[PDB]
Design a protein around this ligand. Structure first.
Ligand code: RT6
Ligand code: RT6
Lengths: 649, 649
């Protein structure tokens, strides 16, 4: 009972944890299944991929190719349909027609065994014909058999008849496969399209108030949705919406002690008004939330709620479930840290005393918001909770509600970010904000779209309430334009935190990535109407970007991405492809200086011969350009951060 | 039911084919088990490796360490004992005592929480004490517990009582390990030391004959073993010893037609005189072979036989089992090709008609030679036979006879060479002869001793009857010296084909790696006594080298090897280590010109601080040197090919 089969087929990829977790995909996504495939001896091998939908039904005949000469690594692109748990195997086989055609091309002109090789071809094409099921397809192959056997023509002319394209036609359709060896099935989990594709917008409802009631409510915040929908966003992510604690409530600018009307951080969940299942009374009631969810739905927006498995000291849990916390010998509970950060206003959950209780409550809490229309959750700081916990929770929820998307806010070491993705988290935050040079971007994106894409889906938020990167601080408005072009086109999921559009870039101090007067500790009213009137918002750019994404399926996927070399360190270029769609992007990473460069396009990667012209259209400007293997660009920051181009038919 | 445990343990290496084949080791070999290990939060993890012998008995406590900061990858070295099938797991755990000690060294001198931090520690040393089952070991920790709680003692003095190395002992002896998580078991296959370590010598018995009987016999050939054993070799590899066919026998110098007395290629196995189970009658009988095998053993030599699963057209199988061959439509059998080489004198075995019959006969044949003292098989050209065939045959033979070593002569693409190693082959031939620059050699060895060492064991033959590399052709005798030093110290198994020591370097043509007047097609008599008197043999160095290998256990293992930088491209340097033994080698790869260089030793890789003296002894010359972080060397070809140095304490 051997491990290797008749024709070796080994290390079928994508693979997640040696096959005990599923590789990931979404409806309509293309990705490449691969395998090492070879045989003993010198004869030709073939391989093909077999996708099985959740019912056992196999997909189209999908043959593979050697991906680089002499490597014995084979690949083919396959595509997922209906959501569910799929499986895939690679089949390898002896390819006798390629083997024979290769030998007949040398032996027949050399006059070697011409009578034997031609009868070899007759007998074999007859065998190829026994499985071809069309009357015409059969009779075509069987005529070549007779032409191979016709002794009254020269051998060179008898062989020629087995290589006409009409024979390759019937043979590409129904190949003759010897010694068919299968790999063991590997699991694939296909999820709804939002799991991979979508633009996210984060805002605080409480900041969208009125002059006479400055603390916003769901009813006042619902009026902010049309602006957000108009920018072309699909998901609206809310910070925690529940009662905020008062004990150790932080004041403005992350000061330890609040004052009389300081609002405190929404992540300080819990007070005697309720916990994670309740609405913060200054926002309104549970019906105000439904109104919000409904108004959001009407505009085409999906609500994502923040799940922060933590408490403020006034959460009812603190006394209702003391065992969900770790108490020091004097009974105090150390405030949470994500060092060097200090979170004095909140308690971390301890998990080893009553793990069943936390699991049951977490899914109850989540099923509560699920009942009110929340189908997406931004999971706050998951890496400070056990990995097997999220694995169990995501399984429970998805077993009944497979459409529920979880997003992991895990800024941490590479191991944990990877593991959290592989145990269930549909999407992941990334290092995107700390990748700002051409080389950082190229490296990270080469990895995220490389092997990582079989378990991670990246969500490129260009800012968060916790991350005002120095690139944006020092670059001003042209910085905000470049990072949006970058995020919206390098990832099929990107996002911004409200105020990005207004280029809010004042840090708490220098060397800090915190916002001065951070929205986390204060209402942050914003004059959206003034900013729009005065053109001091890049909301026009954000909108056209999400428009380009919605008209171009190359931008709705992640794995098909290639960087093109340019002769300036500040100018990056790359293209993505989906079928006939080819988007091509050139960004100037200099926020401060005009750059000109030669972008030397890797023409075959766009599907073109080395010398062809390319009709492209700069979808930001609408202008059309004719490009070739080398193209002169000039990008003036402020005027034009980048060309975002589709190729034209 | 989750995939990930409480404290994650992930991607445990070494692994072969996702765990479906065993990792390899030999009795007494050391190698590193590694794992990705981490936890949620900021407290410390510990991990240890649990190796199990074939009765299940667990090995010593083997704790692991993070291999680089922030990588969450941990490792520990394990050592194999008795032959058999072992297994190994990694356990990870919360390390609460390490976390507390960290907090206690910071908080206690600052005077922060001293009474709480000291009580946290007492309660926890109390917990380590519930697991120590000895009244004294308990009271040891409990005295630290009582001193940690002694409020009549200075805080710095209570803390000291929990950090005495007298307490560090009883804790490294009985660690407090929380939430212990295990990986699933991985299999380890431990083989006798000769599978990894040993020197091979290949020669043709028929070449060692009398002037009246030029075709040698086992009885005359047995007389050549004293020279071989005295040269320090362990294994004697004989080409096929069976009847040679006459149909299409090749003549001298690989000519297609023989003459009246041309001896033919020994690989043309088979005639009505017998096949693979019979002895070529010009060699003597099966009793002469017994005499030869017995006489070889008395000298400390093991016999390795060539197994070539193929036939001359006169083999009895050609008519007894036509189904073991591939027939053209007229019933003839195409002669074997390994293009562009043509082997007109032999037919390849075909495997798809009677695979059980071929298997049964193959293990029948091998058990015959096993019965006559042959416990090693050099499998000729295995990559022209199905991979699963070798898997099932090697499993079968080793199932009854686990000591039988198979060596695979597969010069081919890396996929096949890897798989044959992973399916059973104890040793592999390598690319060694085609790696002659400093960069080629370093790249190859970094690969062979890196991850490849978990499944392949290299046999560094510096020449074969089929490979006289141009390096040896053009370099002459100093080239032959360099490659022997290189082979004998880079791999724990190396070998030479007889005539190497006489520096036979005359090729078939320019551009060939074939031997002129190949022993494969003609008796090749050699005046061994004359060559030694005339000093035209490098047998002294071969003998010196094999002695150095036998006194220096660093040269009897593969995985611990480190390259040291030198400022001349032609001078390579490296060291290997096994326990206290450190061998350090500096070779001049220039065969024609004296090279001088500064060898800049990577002192930590030798186990020294950058300022230490290193007393070495050049095992080739007996000279003694005092070396340091940087060393000037001068190597003259002919006089000194290399320093091979042992360190002195
Ligand atoms: O939930 C805790 C936390 C961390 C998350 N992720 C960070 C961590 C590391 C890298 C940057 C992102 C969340 O997104 C972030 O909103 C949150 O912090 C905010 O809420 C806390 C509770 O009231 C305050 O104590 C704190 O001062 C304030 O900043
Ligand atoms: O057995 C097959 C073969 C090849 C092996 N592998 C080579 C391949 C090329 C690269 C270097 C190694 C082995 O060395 C070698 O035992 C063998 O050759 C010999 O066997 C044939 C049968 O009699 C003769 O026709 C031929 O003339 C003679 O030379």
């Amino acid at each position: 009972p051997t491990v290797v089969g008749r024709i070796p087929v080994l290390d079928v990829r994508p693979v997640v944890q040696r096959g005990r977790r599923p590789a990931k995909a979404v409806t309509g996504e293309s990705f490449e299944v691969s395998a090492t495939v070879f045989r003993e001896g010198h004869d030709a091998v073939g391989a093909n991929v077999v996708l099985r939908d959740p019912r056992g039904r196999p997909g189209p005949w999908t043959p593979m190719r050697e991906l680089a000469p002499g490597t014995d690594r084979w690949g083919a692109t396959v595509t997922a349909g209906e959501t569910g748990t799929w499986s895939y195997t690679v089949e390898a086989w002896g390819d006798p027609v390629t083997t024979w055609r290769h030998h007949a091309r040398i032996k027949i002109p050399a006059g070697l065994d011409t009578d034997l090789v031609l009868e070899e071809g007759a007998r074999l094409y007859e065998r190829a014909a026994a499985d071809v099921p069309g009357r015409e397809d059969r009779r075509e192959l069987l005529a070549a058999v007779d032409a191979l056997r016709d002794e009254s023509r020269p051998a060179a002319s008898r062989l020629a008849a087995a290589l006409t394209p009409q024979v390759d036609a019937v043979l590409a359709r129904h190949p003759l496969r010897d010694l068919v060896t299968s790999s063991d099935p590997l699991p694939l989990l296909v999820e709804r399209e939002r799991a991979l594709y979508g633009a996210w917008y984060e805002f605080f409802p409480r900041s969208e108030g009125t002059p006479h009631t400055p603390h916003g409510t769901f009813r006042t915040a619902a009026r902010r949705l049309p602006a957000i929908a108009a920018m072309g966003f699909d998901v609206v992510y809310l910070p925690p919406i529940h009662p905020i604690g008062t004990t150790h409530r932080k004041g403005r600018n992350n000061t330890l002690s609040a004052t009389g009307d300081d609002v405190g951080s929404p992540w300080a969940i819990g007070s005697p008004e309720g916990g994670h299942d309740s609405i913060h009374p200054a926002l309104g009631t549970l019906d105000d939330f439904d109104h919000f969810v409904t108004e959001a739905g009407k505009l085409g927006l999906e609500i994502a709620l923040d799940f922060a498995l933590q408490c403020s000291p006034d959460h009812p849990w603190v006394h209702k479930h003391p065992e969900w916390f770790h108490h020091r010998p004097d009974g105090t509970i150390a405030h949470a840290e994500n060092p060097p950060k200090k979170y004095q206003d909140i308690y971390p959950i301890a998990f080893d005393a009553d793990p069943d209780g936390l699991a049951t409550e977490t899914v109850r809490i989540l099923r509560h918001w699920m009942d009110h229309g929340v189908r997406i959750f931004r999971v706050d700081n998951p890496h400070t909770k056990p990995v097997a916990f999220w694995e169990r929770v995501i399984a429970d929820i998805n077993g009944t509600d497979p459409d529920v998307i979880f997003l992991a806010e895990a800024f941490t070491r590479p191991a944990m970010m990877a593991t959290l993705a592989q145990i269930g988290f549909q999407q992941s935050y990334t290092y995107f904000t700390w990748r700002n040079t051409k080389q950082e971007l190229t490296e990270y994106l080469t990895e995220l779209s490389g092997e990582a894409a079989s378990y991670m889906r990246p969500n490129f938020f260009a800012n968060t309430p916790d991350i005002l990167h120095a690139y944006l601080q020092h670059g001003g408005r042209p910085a905000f334009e470049v990072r949006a072009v970058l995020a919206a086109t390098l990832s099929p999921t990107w996002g911004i935190y409200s105020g990005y559009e207004l280029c809010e870039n004042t840090p708490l101090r220098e060397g800090s990535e915190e916002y001065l007067d951070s929205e986390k500790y204060q209402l942050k009213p914003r004059d959206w109407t003034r900013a729009a009137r005065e053109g001091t918002t890049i909301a026009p750019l954000v909108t056209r970007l999400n428009t380009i994404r919605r008209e171009n399926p190359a931008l709705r996927q992640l794995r098909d991405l290639h960087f093109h070399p340019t002769d300036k360190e500040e100018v990056i270029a790359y293209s993505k492809r989906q079928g006939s769609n080819t988007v091509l992007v050139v960004v100037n990473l200099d926020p401060r200086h005009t750059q000109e460069a030669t972008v030397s396009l890797d023409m075959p990667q766009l599907g073109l011969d080395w010398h062809e012209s390319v009709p492209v259209r700069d979808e930001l400007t609408g202008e059309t350009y004719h490009w070739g293997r080398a193209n002169y660009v000039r990008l003036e920051p402020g005027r034009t951060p980048a060309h975002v181009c589709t190729v034209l038919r």
